[PDB]
Every structure is written in C-alpha cells, then in structure tokens.
Ligand binder design. Structure first.
Ligand code: TXL
Ligand code: GTP
Ligand code: GDP
Lengths: 440, 427
C-alpha cells in the first residue's frame, strides 16, 4: 500500500516495461490496483479534469511508472505514435545526450547530468501515495545506461532509500550476446549494485529465453519482441501476483529475505513453468503440481545457469491461478525428494511458496496458453556462481588482460572501475562458492 | 538527435556523395527523423525553411560539400538529383585541383580548409546534438587525400568528443595515380592519429568482385558502384538511426570496432547483393544474410579477410526479422572461423537491428569489422611507399606543395608499425 516504484534503465529496460506495462493490461498497476473500470488504453476510463500525469487518477488509472532513456530510441517508441499505449506523459525521460555504451558513459558521463532530474522525478513519484515498498530496475549487462547509469541510479537510490530494497531485473550476457564490451562491462555494472545497494535481482538470460523458446515452446524464428514476454511475464508473477489479493502472499519484502542468504547481492533465477504452446494440447490442462517440476527443469530456466552445478539455495516459488494448497505442500515436497535439488547445507525447508489470483494473464498468440496454473522459481543456486566466472574469464582477457578500455577511460575513471570491479565481483566467485561447498 | 555533419571531398567523396545521398530522399538522412514514415516527396527538398537543419531529413539537404576542382560542382549541381543546396557547396575557384596530399591539404586546401570551417560551424550549430562527422575521401585524392586529412584533423582537434566517421577509398592492385602509394600513406598518418574514429574501406578493386560476382551487371560502372556504397553507409548512418530494437548509435560504432586507439579500420559488406534475375534465391535470408556477411567474396573492401583473424566484428541487420534469429545465426559464423576470432575478444560479434528494411530489398545486412588481415591493405602500400615515394623519391611534385622529407618518413614509420602493431594481435 506497498507500492513499487518502477524504473527502467535501458533499451533492455524501456522495452521490457512494454512487456511489463502491457502485461499489466488487466486493471493492475504497481501497488495500487486498488481497482479500475478502465480498460484498454485507459482512454475510456474517463477524463476527470486534469493534465499531464494525472491527479484525477491513481497509479491504478495510470501507472507506478519511470522510464529512463538515454537515447529517444526506445522511448520514442513508448512515446512512439502514441504507440497504442499511452501510459502517461512525464513518467518518461528521454535524454538526447546521445547514447553511450560503456559503464563509464552515461554512468559517469551523460548520465550523471541526468540522473538527478530523474532522481527528482523519482522522489516526487516516490511521494504521491503511501507505502512504496519496492523499486524496480530494468538492467542489462551491457547498456551504458544500464551499467554505470544503473550503478548510478541504483547507487543513489540505495544511498537515498536504504530501507527500500530495490529489485532490479537483468538481461545478462551468456555465450552469445551483443557488443564486445559486455564481457566485461556488465562486470562494471555488477560491482555497483552490489554494495551500492540493491536487493534481490532477477534475470532473464537472453540465451536461456531463446532456448526455452526452442525447447519448451515453439518458434525458433522469434524476435526479441517475443523474448520480452517471457521475461515480461516473470514480473507479473513477482509484482502483480504478490501485489494482488490472495493466499500466502509474499511482498517485495518477502522477496529480499527469501532470496537473500547472505549479503553480497544476490541473484536469482526465474522459471515460468506455464509456457504451453499455441500448438500444445497440454494433457487438456497441464497438471498443476507438475508445474513445480517445470520449474526445476533445467528447461524453463531463463539463464544458462547449469544447476547441475551445486546446491540451490533460496527457492521462492509463486503459484497463481487455480492452484491447490495440497498441490503446493504436496508437490513442493516432492522436489525435496529428488536427489537433485541438492539444496544447500543451510536451507531449511527451502522453499517459499505463494499463491496468487487471477489466473495466468495472457494476450495474443505470441503469449502461449491460457494456463491456469503457474510456477515461478526464483532461486539462488550455486550456478550463478559460474556465469559470473564466465564473465570473469572474459574480463581477465577482454578488458584488463590487454585492455579494451580506451573508449571507457575517455568517459571517466581508470584502474579501478575495472580493477576494483574484478576483485570485488571476483571474490564474489570465491565467496559465493564457499557459500555452498562444505558442511561448515 | 544524433544529428549530422556532412563533409564530402574530392572526387570520390563528392561523387560518392552523389550516390550515398541519393539513396536518401529514401528519407532519413542523417538526423531529423520523420518523413520517411508515409512516403512522399522527392528530390532535393520539400516544404519549409531553409537552411541547413532540414539537413538530411524534411525540407532540406544538409551537407557540407567539398570539392576542390570544380568537378563536383557541375557533375551533380544542376540537372542532377540535387540543388544540392546552395550555401553548403565549395568550389575551389580553380585551385586547379591537385594531385598530391600536400596539395590541397597543405596548399589550396588550407585556404579552403579554412572555408570548410564555416560549413562545419553552421551545421554543428543546428540545434541538434551532432554525433557524426561524415567524410568521403580518396586514397590518392590529393584534394581528398591530403585535404581530407586537413579537414579531419581540425575536426578532431575541435570536436574531440565527436568520433569521426570516415568513408575511405584505397589502393588495390590496379591503380590510380602512381603517386598513390605514398599519397594515401600520408593520408594515413593522418587517418589513424587524426581523429577519425573509424574508417571505412571501399576498395574499388574489391568493389568490382561484388558488382560482378554477386551481381551480374554486365559492364559496371562508376555510377553503379555508387549503388554499392550507399549500402554500406545506410546501415551505419540510417540504420540504428532510423528506428530500432537493439539500436547502435554511431558511438557503438567506435567501441565496437576499435579495440584500442590507433585508427581502427574496417571492412564492410552488404548482403542482398542479389542478381536482378537471380532475384529468386533465399527470401532475403538471415543465414543468407550471415552467410554473405563473412565470405571472402562479399566483402566490399580490398582485403580478403580470410587471411587472418578479425578483431571486432560489427554486423547490422534491418529486415524486420527475429531479434532471436539474427543473434542465433551470427554464432555459427563464429565457430567456423575460430582462427578468425581473435582469442581475445569475446563477444567477437556484435549485432544491431533496426526496423525498416531498406526501401525495396525487403531485408538487409550490413557488416563491419577489423581483423588481422589488414596487416595486408597496408603491407602493400608500404612496400609501395618504401620502394616508391620514399625510395629513389617521387615528391618533387609534392616537394613544392610544402612537405620536405617529412610526411613521408613519418608516414611510413607510423603507419608501418601499424603493420607490426596490428599483427601483434594474433601472431
Ligand atoms: C542496391 C541494390 O540492392 O541494388 C540492386 C542491384 O543489385 C542489388 C540487389 C537488389 O535486390 C536489386 C537488384 C533489387 O532488385 C531491389 O528490389 C531493388 C532494391 C532494393 C532497390 O534498392 C532499394 O530500393 C534500396 O532501398 C536501395 N536503394 C538504392 O540502391 O537506391 C539507389 C537510389 C542507389 C539506386 C538501398 C539499399 C540499402 C540501403 C538503402 C537503400 C534497387 C534496385 O533497383 C536494384 O539495383 C539495381 O538495379 C542497380 C543497378 C546498377 C547499379 C545499381 C543498382 C537492386 C531495386 C528496386 C530493383
Ligand atoms: N531480451 C531482451 N534483451 C534485450 C532487449 N532490449 C535489449 N536487450 C539486450 O540488451 C543488450 C543491450 O542492448 P542495447 O540496446 O545495446 O542497450 P542500450 O540501452 O542501447 O545500450 P547503451 O547505448 O550503452 O545505452 C543487448 O544484449 C540486447 O540483447 C529486449 O527487449 N529483450
Ligand atoms: N568509387 C569511386 N572511386 C572514384 C571516383 N572517382 C574517382 N575514384 C577513384 O579514386 C581515385 C582518386 O580519384 P579522386 O577521388 O578524383 O582523387 P582526388 O580527388 O585527386 O583525391 C581514383 O584513382 C579512382 O580510382 C568515384 O566517383 N567513385
């Protein structure tokens, strides 16, 4: 009452919202669904007086809301030919500072200059209403506005709002990707969240999504415009669900503790087990509790985080729509019945389970099912422990090894931003590993 | 708002101007935006107010034009595709055009090289934030070769922040000049080390392979070669500029292809080369499009990249295809090309996609990159230089223009180590 505050960060982020904000399209909003009759663009809901941003209406009628664009590009979309969605004016930032890929750029450089005005927006935004219990950040692991800008925008937000754990989303590099910059680079963006602040984070592994689309759904041809829905939907579960009236409800402060097992920002995985085809025939309906397993399947797995490795840690599962109590208590048991899940040495009935209603929202053919039973696995497993290694083999050789910084220095600091980000994000690797490598 | 600076020099540059730009009332030209959304118009303008800012988008043609010998005046100004514009056009008043780097660069150009400051100023101002400096230019140009390096040098000097984009034309085993060995070598020390951020290649000896292999053309042409390049520029300049789901602004262009400071040079391709008739093969494919983006045969440059490893590969596809599809395909390139990938470097390939396929291809592919191969494009002009100009010397011609042992010796040694330093990667 327990609002979220929704921040975008970059290309990855302005769109991703389009996935978030479209997925909302059911009369909900960040933390205020306290209800609405409007529909559609919301046009038809009325105009009660007003002007830019709406006093007439609550976040409900119009959103939780804050897009940061360091290029008009994606933002022109969301602004684009009143792109079918006018979700408000003046919750967008569009900085024509000319975009910058660099953790250094935008974060140290153009961003500094317009992280403030934004801070101001956030602040005002952080004020109209009550209980904000959440900050959402869409982040990449590559996009200048997403690294330093986010290490900027997460850092200031952590510093300014220590009590409100931030949630941020991620879209991390894997085996394939964009740039050369992103092997390190996101490294840099990884330092910052970290101890700047942050809470639990989530990712969509772009190399996991297009994988799950090829192993679990159908359409190998697919556009990112579609991968956003896989990741878009992750959120709906996280916020729309826990943020809407139901049984066993985890708020954004449930998310922090259930994922967080120790304090070097932790990371999580998202599994959406309902993912049925337009071309499926789920055994008329897909078994509710199998849905749980769907989770563990390495296959729903958003990232290339081979669970193979190690013992999960924190496991937070959010079930929504027509789920049964005896489905959870009794299906969740089962997992902790295989060998494999190998929960950690200090996991104590690790599994956190929430139920939410209504149903699994959906729209359009690109959306798969109308599945009426959902699993969202948010976990902290040792794996993560290896994808950062991956980025760290890249980094020991891409940036530091022989250095790819001459662009980056150009925008700001040398010899840490880099050295510090490797050593601090490094031990992450060692410390992480030691979190789950012996009984001690 | 990432607006844009148009500088066109010499022959290859002014004429090349003719063919880049006309592919634009295709409408996006350089940073307005709009227009191009529901057809219409054409020519050398529209409906508003002039000057300048209607740039390369609605009512105006924005460019900075630099001709040094009234060849670009008459060749396009008049009867041809433009107006241009007035006031935006340089005609050197007979300077007499020069063959020789030192010559419009040190000589007539200085005088004009100053008059090119006024063009740059007015454009710069435009009320938009300029992110490109676009320059056509010619190895062996003197006007272009050594005037383009003058133009480039001040522009890096005054506009450090704004990485220069320069189109290049080169030496291939076939020739113009005889002084082009060394002419483009001096055009070099300045093209590395002269604020030119990234550097395009357009070898005319390689352009033919394309306009004649991929293409059938029965008898190419220098105007038809101007279809080729438009390709290589629109991807860079229009693409990513024009709308887009992962969009790369020009500056992504300078961190993606340079992995270090000395002037990283690239090679670039356009696939959708197609054959008029052959028109019928692979419905604008991606693999199609990936396929054609690496081959030894489809690169629109004078290096055959296969000898060696690329260091950076920037590819861009703007067909409306899967953002999953382009990225999934580019991997396959990377794994049958190891040795073509630089062991440092991960993510050896960047991919960008924009949202409108070139007017009438339906689906597009642009490519960028630096490999180890270029140790070539130069270990050829240098063998040339040491044995040519610097050799038993050919610069009396230039020796009057004002360069004395310098600009030769420095250009070989600085541009040389280029060869060693470049190689350094992956020996
Ligand atoms: C370029 C290209 O695709 O040239 C070729 C020659 O080999 C290339 C492969 C193409 O498949 C082919 C053969 C086409 O069939 C295609 O249907 C087509 C397109 C896409 C046009 O190109 C465009 O409309 C584009 O929008 C093109 N526009 C373009 O070239 O505009 C010019 C004004 C430069 C002509 C462009 C490309 C990339 C970015 C931006 C624009 C140019 C074409 O005339 C044609 O070129 C030829 O027949 C031909 C013959 C000799 C010289 C040049 C072209 C074109 C037509 C209309 C036929
Ligand atoms: N899954 C997914 N990935 C996306 C999407 N948009 C961007 N990305 C990923 O984000 C990464 C960076 O995207 P860019 O658009 O280059 O980021 P940016 O915001 O342009 O980067 P900067 O110019 O530095 O600010 C790439 O690896 C993309 O794959 C999207 O909607 N979905
Ligand atoms: N692609 C292309 N190359 C050209 C054109 N005109 C000349 N060239 C080539 O570029 C070289 C230099 O010519 P030009 O640009 O006139 O030289 P400059 O002006 O004296 O530097 C020649 O040897 C040609 O091979 C043109 O219109 N297009």
């Amino acid at each position: 009452m327990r609002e979220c505050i929704s921040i975008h960060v970059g290309q990855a982020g302005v769109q991703i919202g389009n996935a978030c904000w479209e997925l909302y399209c059911l009369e909900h909003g960040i933390q205020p669904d306290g209800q609405m009759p409007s529909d559609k663009t919301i046009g038809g809901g009325d105009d009660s007086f007003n002007t830019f941003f709406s006093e007439t209406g609550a976040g409900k009628h119009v959103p939780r809301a804050v897009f940061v664009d360091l290029e008009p590009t994606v933002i022109d979309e969301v602004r684009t030919g009143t792109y079918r969605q006018l979700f408000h004016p003046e919750q967008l930032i569009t900085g024509k500072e000319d975009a910058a890929n660099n953790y250094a750029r935008g974060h140290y450089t153009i961003g500094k200059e317009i992280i403030d005005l934004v801070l101001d927006r956030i602040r005002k935004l952080a004020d109209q209403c009550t209980g904000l219990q959440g900050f959402s950040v869409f982040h990449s692991f590559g996009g200048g506005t997403g690294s330093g800008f986010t290490s900027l925008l997460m850092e200031r937000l952590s510093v300014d709002y220590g009590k409100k754990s931030k949630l941020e989303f991620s879209i991390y590099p894997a085996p394939q990707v964009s740039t050369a910059v992103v092997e390190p680079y996101n490294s840099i963006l990884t330092t910052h969240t970290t101890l700047e602040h942050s809470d639990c984070a989530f990712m969509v592994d772009n190399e996991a999504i297009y994988d799950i689309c090829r192993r679990n759904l159908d359409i190998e041809r697919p556009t990112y415009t579609n991968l956003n829905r896989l990741i878009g939907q992750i959120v709906s579960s996280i916020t729309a669900s826990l943020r809407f009236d139901g049984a066993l409800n985890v708020d954004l402060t449930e998310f922090q503790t259930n994922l967080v097992p120790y304090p070097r920002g932790h990371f999580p995985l998202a599994t959406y087990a309902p993912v049925i085809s337009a071309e499926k025939a789920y055994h008329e309906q897909l078994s509710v509790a199998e849905i749980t397993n769907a989770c563990f399947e390495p296959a729903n797995q958003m990232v290339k985080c081979d669970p193979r490795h190690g013992k999960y840690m924190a496991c937070c599962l959010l079930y929504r729509g027509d789920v049964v109590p005896k489905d959870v208590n009794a299906a969740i048991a089962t997992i902790k019945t295989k060998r494999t899940i190998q929960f950690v040495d200090w996991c104590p009935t690790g599994f956190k389970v929430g139920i939410n209603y209504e149903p699994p929202t959906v729209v359009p053919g690109g959306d798969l099912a109308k599945v009426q039973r959902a699993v969202c696995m948010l976990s902290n497993t040792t794996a993560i422990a290896e994808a950062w290694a991956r980025l760290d083999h890249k980094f020991d050789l891409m940036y530091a090894k022989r250095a790819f910084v001459h662009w980056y220095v150009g925008e700001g600091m040398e010899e840490g931003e880099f050295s510090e980000a490797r050593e601090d994000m490094a031990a992450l690797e060692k410390d992480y590993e030691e979190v789950g490598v012996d009984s001690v | 708002m990432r607006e844009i600076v148009h500088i066109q020099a010499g022959q290859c540059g002014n004429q090349i101007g003719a063919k880049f730009w006309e592919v634009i009332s295709d409408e996006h030209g350089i940073d307005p935006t709009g227009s191009y959304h529901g057809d219409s118009d054409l020519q050398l303008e529209r409906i508003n107010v002039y000057y300048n800012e209607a740039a390369g988008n609605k009512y105006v043609p924005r460019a900075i034009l630099v001709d040094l010998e009234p060849g670009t005046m008459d060749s396009v100004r008049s009867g041809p595709f433009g107006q241009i514009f007035r006031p935006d056009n340089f005609v050197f008043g007979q300077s007499g055009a020069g063959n020789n780097w030192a010559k419009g660069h040190y000589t007539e150009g200085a005088e004009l090289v100053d008059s090119v400051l006024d063009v740059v100023r007015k454009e710069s101002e435009s009320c938009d934030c300029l992110q490109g400096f676009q320059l056509t230019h010619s190895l062996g140009g003197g006007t272009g070769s050594g005037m383009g390096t003058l133009l480039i040098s001040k522009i890096r000097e005054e506009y450090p922040d704004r990485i220069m984009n320069t189109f290049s034309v080169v030496p291939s085993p076939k020739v113009s000049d005889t002084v082009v060995e060394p002419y483009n070598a001096t055009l070099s020390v300045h093209q590395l080390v002269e604020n030119t951020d990234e550097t395009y290649c357009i070898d005319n000896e390689a352009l033919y392979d394309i306009c004649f292999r991929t293409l059938k053309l029965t008898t190419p042409t220098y105007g038809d070669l101007n279809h080729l390049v438009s390709a290589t520029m629109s991807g860079v300049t229009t693409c990513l500029r024009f709308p887009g789901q992962l969009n790369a602004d020009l500056r992504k262009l300078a961190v993606n292809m340079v992995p270090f400071p000395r002037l990283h040079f690239f090679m670039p391709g356009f696939a959708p080369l197609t054959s008029r008739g052959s028109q019928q093969y692979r419905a604008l494919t991606v693999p199609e499009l990936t396929q054609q983006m690496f081959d030894a045969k489809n690169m629109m440059a004078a290096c055959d990249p296969r000898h060696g490893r690329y260091l950076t590969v920037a590819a861009v596809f703007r067909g409306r295809m899967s953002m999953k599809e382009v990225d999934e395909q580019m991997l396959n390139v990377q794994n049958k090309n190891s040795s073509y990938f630089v062991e440092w470097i991960p993510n050896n390939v960047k991919t960008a996609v924009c949202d409108i396929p070139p007017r009438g291809l339906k689906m597009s592919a642009t490519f960028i990159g630096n490999s180890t191969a270029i140790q070539e494009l130069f270990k050829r002009i240098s063998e040339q230089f040491t044995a040519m100009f610097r050799r038993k010397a050919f610069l009396h011609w230039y020796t009057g223009e004002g360069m004395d042992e310098m600009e030769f010796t420095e250009a070989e040694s600085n541009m040389n180590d280029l060869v060693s330093e470049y190689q350094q990667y992956q020996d």
